[PDB]
Amino acid sequence: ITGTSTVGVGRGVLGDQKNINTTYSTYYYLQDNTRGDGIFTYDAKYRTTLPGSLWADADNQFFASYDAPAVDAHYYAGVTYDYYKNVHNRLSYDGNNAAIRSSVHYSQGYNNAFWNGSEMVYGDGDGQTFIPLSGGIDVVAHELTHAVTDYTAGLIYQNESGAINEAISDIFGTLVEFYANKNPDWEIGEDVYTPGISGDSLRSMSDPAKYGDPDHYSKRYTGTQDNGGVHINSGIINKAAYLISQGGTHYGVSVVGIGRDKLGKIFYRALTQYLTPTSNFSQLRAAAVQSATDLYGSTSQEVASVKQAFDAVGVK
Ligand SMILES: NC(=O)[C@H](Cc1ccccc1)C[N+](=O)[O-]
Ligand SMILES: [Ca+2]
Ligand SMILES: [Ca+2]
Ligand SMILES: [Ca+2]
Ligand SMILES: [Ca+2]
Ligand SMILES: [Zn+2]
């Protein structure tokens, strides 16, 4: 809507206080005019009709429990926007400052979040398996990253191309989490997953097998469930990315780590200049090797590490 940019204050899902960019016009709306063509957060009101209504607030204070999911969805979308802009010189997900829209309070007890091709959608969780999912910065960045992928590589969401699609979202969701630098780690969704259990997560990049996901090509899922295992086989790529960045010896193969920043540079380049809708794991290895080559040279440690990483997970 048309109005004047203001700054509200509230509390996120984890009870943390933060300032959020709003817009005043009779009501204070969750509309951030400071980033690109704006970041808009809507209320789904426990239903499934999207996007719902632009979040309206009477006094610009967002401390109600009902407000929490909206506060985080709005704030973290901003952090993710900043990541892509400041780190990769990318303006919003389409590269041309497209408006970023999110809807919270989607359905009832909905234990998931997703990008529907046009916007972000967050369930509140059932309070047992999940709490409002927008509370996890890695979850928010993961979902927004799907928008980036859809506008760039366009990886088909099934089988190996789908597994890469998932991994790219886990990778950048994690890199964004490290960017915000608040309790960063290589796990996925630990901040909003099972409030009753300590130290677990939905997925692990450092050790996919911890939650039953493959950490080597020889253990890939070939069934039809989960669109051919996109959330399962993603572990193979997640492990490789973890190794490229942190290094280590996996199944007897040693990898020299090069750090998170270079991991991000290599994968961002592969995603935006080499990967295609039908790219498979072997093709991802080639894209990453070529990306590292462009960025650091064919004889660089970076290129050697990318090769070791994929060798370690059995991807040739
Ligand atoms: N099915 C899920 O739980 C996934 C949603 C999710 C993704 C990242 C973190 C937490 C939840 C599907 N996905 O990755 O789009
Ligand atoms: Ca209020
Ligand atoms: Ca964390
Ligand atoms: Ca995490
Ligand atoms: Ca937990
Ligand atoms: Zn995903």
Residues of the chain with CATH 1.10.390.10: 155-315
Q: Which atom of ligand 1 is found nearest the CA of 230?
A: 14
Q: Identify the helix (H) or strand (E) that includes residue 52.
A: none
Q: Which atom of ligand 1 is found nearest the CA of 173?
A: 8
> Strand, coil or helix: what is 294?
helix
- Cβ(189) – ligand 1 distance below 6 Å: yes
Structure tokens at 67: 């407000």
CA distance 104 to 42: 6
88 given a catalytic annotation: no
Residues of the chain with CATH 3.10.170.10: 6-154
- Cβ(202) – ligand 1 distance below 6 Å: yes
Query: What CATH number has the domain spanning 155-315?
Result: 1.10.390.10
- Cβ(269) – ligand 1 distance below 6 Å: no
Closest to 134 in 3D by CA, of 62, 71, 198, 181: 71
Q: Which of 143, 160, 216, 302 is catalytic?
A: 143
Q: How far is the CA of 169 from the centre of ligand 6 (A)?
A: 6
How do strand 120-122 and strand 100-104 relate by DSSP bridges? parallel
Which residues are registered as beta bridge partners of 20? Answer: 8
Q: Is the dihedral of CA 141, 147, 151, 156 positive or negative?
A: positive
- The number of helices, as runs of H, and strands, as runs of E, in the chain is 8, 15
Annotated binding site for Zn(2+): 142, 146, 166
What does the DSSP 8-state code read for residue 273? I
Q: Which of 105, 216, 231, 250 is catalytic?
A: 231
Residue found under tokens 């997703």: 114
CA distance 124 to 280: 34
Side chain identity, residue 190: E
Residue 67 Cα to chain centre, angstroms: 22
160 given a catalytic annotation: no
- Cβ(157) – ligand 1 distance below 6 Å: no
Tell me which of 3.40.630.30, 3.10.110.10, 3.10.170.10, 3.40.640.10 is the CATH number of domain 6-154: 3.10.170.10
Q: Identify the helix (H) or strand (E) that includes residue 313.
A: none
Structure-determination approach:
X-ray
**What residues have CB less than 8 Å from 311, skipping those under 6 apart?**
253
Resolution in A: 1.9
| Rg (the chain; Cα; Å) | 19
Long-range CB contacts (within 8 A, 24+) of 94-101: 94/147, 94/151, 95/151, 97/36, 97/37, 98/36, 98/37, 99/36, 99/37, 99/38, 99/39, 99/40, 100/35, 100/36, 100/38, 100/39, 100/40, 100/144, 101/39, 101/40, 101/41, 101/42, 101/51
CA distance 69 to 120: 13
